[PDB]
Ligand binder design. Structure first.
Ligand SMILES: C[C@H](CS)C(=O)N1CCC[C@@H]1C(=O)O
Ligand SMILES: [Zn+2]
Length: 224
């Protein structure tokens, strides 16, 4: 399918969005409502994800998390706002989106001319630090700059799943916005947290990996 929504563990699902360059996002099906992790590429791709969500649960989509300011994590925002979902991010992500959205849209369209020239749609729930959703079962945190200055991780403690965002993935990928020297420092700060992790979901390439994906990418970026 153009997009798939698949259970990883209990309420924790992975989204494979095959539009444009494949990106993987996540969904958490909570008792009172649904949390989307990563807005997907466009308002149309967001609508496609919502269609899949409405075959699994009738509960409202409460919020979407922009895990960075880039088009693959924030492009769907207009759609999510249009159906009453809050758009959630860190202060830094919101700040960078405000200043740099035009630039990232232009960059995206250089490789993907078919990609729409999307207007800015900012997060409207903006956090000064780390934050949780779903009564602490969805835990967003910043461990430093990497693929972008602002990219965050999302951890699901009950299921021991870490969403890797654009930070963790199989291939070196795009380094145009990256802090290449900070990248391994951020991955080491992450590993120093000693989170129980059974599964890491890569934000690009094949989603399902073990905790070793962290060390895999760390080795790649040190050689870049
Ligand atoms: C389409 C490009 C290829 S460098 C891409 O993968 N982008 C552009 C912004 C979001 C995403 C990324 O770098 O993770
Ligand atoms: Zn990405």
């Amino acid at each position: 399918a153009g997009m798939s929504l698949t259970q990883v563990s209990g309420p924790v699902y992975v989204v494979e969005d095959n539009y444009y360059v494949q990106e993987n996002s996540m969904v958490y099906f909570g008792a009172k409502g649904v949390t989307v992790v990563g807005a997907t590429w466009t308002p149309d791709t967001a609508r496609e994800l919502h269609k899949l969500i409405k075959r699994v649960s009738r509960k409202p989509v409460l919020e979407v998390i922009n895990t960075n300011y880039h088009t693959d994590r924030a492009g769907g925002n207009a759609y999510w706002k249009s159906i009453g979902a809050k758009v959630v991010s860190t202060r830094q992500t919101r700040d960078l989106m405000k200043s740099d959205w035009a630039e990232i849209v232009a960059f995206t369209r250089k490789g993907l001319p078919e990609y729409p020239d999307l207007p800015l749609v900012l997060p409207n729930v903006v956090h000064d630090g780390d934050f949780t959703l779903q009564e602490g079962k969805v835990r967003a945190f910043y461990a430093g700059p990497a693929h972008t200055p602002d990219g965050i991780f999302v951890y699901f403690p009950d299921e021991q799943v870490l969403y890797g965002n654009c930070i963790l993935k199989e291939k070196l990928g795009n380094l145009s916005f990256a802090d290449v020297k900070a990248y391994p420092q951020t991955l080491e700060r992450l590993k120093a947290m000693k989170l129980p992790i059974k599964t890491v979901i890569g934000g690009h390439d094949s989603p399902l990996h073990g905790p070793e994906l962290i060390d895999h990418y760390e080795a790649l970026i040190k050689a870049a």
